[PDB]
Design a protein around this ligand. Sequence first.
Ligand SMILES: O=C(O)CCC(=O)C(=O)O
Ligand SMILES: O=C(O)CCC(=O)C(=O)O
Ligand SMILES: [K+]
Lengths: 197, 206
Amino acid sequence: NNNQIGENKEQTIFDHKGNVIKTEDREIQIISKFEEPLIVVLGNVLSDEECDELIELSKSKLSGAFLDDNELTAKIEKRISSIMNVPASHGEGLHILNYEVDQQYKAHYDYFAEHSRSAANNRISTLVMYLNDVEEGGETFFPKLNLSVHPRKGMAVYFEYFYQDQSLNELTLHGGAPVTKGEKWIATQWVRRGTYK
Amino acid sequence: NQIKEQTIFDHKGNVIKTEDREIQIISKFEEPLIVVLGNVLSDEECDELIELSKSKLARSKVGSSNDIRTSSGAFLDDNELTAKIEKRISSIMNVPASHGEGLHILNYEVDQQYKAHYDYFAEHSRSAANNRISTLVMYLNDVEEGGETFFPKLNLSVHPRKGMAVYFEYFYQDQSLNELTLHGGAPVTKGEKWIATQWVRRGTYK
Ligand SMILES: O=C(O)CCC(=O)C(=O)O
Ligand SMILES: O=C(O)CCC(=O)C(=O)O
Ligand SMILES: [K+]
């Protein structure tokens, strides 16, 4: 029952210790952390072939679109659940987005306004997975924090917005900067507070 | 019509093409500028640097018997490998290799740490005549737990990952921006940590 040590900080959903996240089928690398709100750059999230397969599944179906469930998407969602420390049933599913040149995603929040039907089971965290390499542009940027993550195939950026202090959630404003050369493919997993699917 | 101080590192885009390798720009903290970089050193280059740091090429002892000091670690005298790596690093850092102090190798064992500090020298010192302006810390091995490079005034950490590096600079006119680059190496709690550091001076050093 010792004295208080350091300042009191809100607990996060992502609570992994160390430099690696050992999932059932892959060891994910913790690359960098912005402490609060928690933004984590992750390495070795998806294999090259998994990235290819997700893009292919996306093209055959066609803003973006969710993939239909199959053995690959369930495998990937299971791995993602280990990273995000929330059961896969809380995720909305693998949503695939393709940016052509000059396309972008203007800054926004991923959680829903309190006064909306969707906020009854609100989003609490996001994982953005880079499915290809982007010749130029396409950074994921957080303008209130002056932090950017640059696309790199197989890597991902994790961030959460489940804080009691709503100003911390409001620091998670983020966008996809315009692609200026090449194209950008991402998969996004948005995680809800409760079971979604 | 007008629409921030300029930086030494001014690379545009997602990669840095050097004479022999394409380095990956992974993440950027804008000001003071801190950049996580991928694909800096190959696995074998990391292993060889570690081995060289235990040879007669080293000028001192690379390992220590809890707080790392400025006498801890060793500079490597020049050979074919170190020159090749310094040439690559110079393209990353946008400064000629002759401004670098040379590869400095440091080994941390369990419980060892580098308490938070600045890399630049105090104005009132002989070393400030040709002060340091930027640092590249290259991770030469994997660390299971601990060993993060942390910036306590910015609440940002970079975790060790073999072959990656963190770059940061402290050549700003606004001195408060330089003082935001206070950083350290968090204690290694499982395994060991090997790094190479290149410190770059404003003018020719060697
Ligand atoms: O394209 C990006 O980098 C950002 C993606 C994003 O904002 C999302 O998928 O929710
Ligand atoms: O060990 C680290 O992560 C940081 C080392 C450092 O601060 C330096 O090499 O100058
Ligand atoms: K030293």
